[PDB]
Amino acid sequence: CLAVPGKVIEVNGPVAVVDFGGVKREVRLDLMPDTKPGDWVIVHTGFAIEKLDEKKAMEILEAWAEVEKAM
Structure with missing residues (x-):
């Protein structure tokens, strides 16, 4: 809905592939370089900002x- 977590499925250096409900995007891991496949991340402007x-x-x-239900 807004900054929803995605699942890290691949890590190659400072770049991850992260799955957001079926849709895979490339995500920079510089801020969280220990991130591994199977982790979940929140992404802001293309960078993982929380593991x-x-x-x-x-x-x-x-x-x-x-x-969303409440509104």
């Missing part, structure tokens, strides 16, 4: 679903 796990990604999606 998170699946559990937290789920909770964020649940919150979005809730705010």
Whole structure:
């Protein structure tokens, strides 16, 4: 919905491929260089700015679903 987490599926140096609901995008990892496939990330202007796990990604999606329903 807005800055929704994506799943890191590939890492090549400072560039990752990250899957956002089926749509893969290239994402820069310079700010989080330890990121690995299987991690989740929040992305701002093409750069991963937070690394998170699946559990937290789920909770964020649940919150979005809730705010959207509430509005």
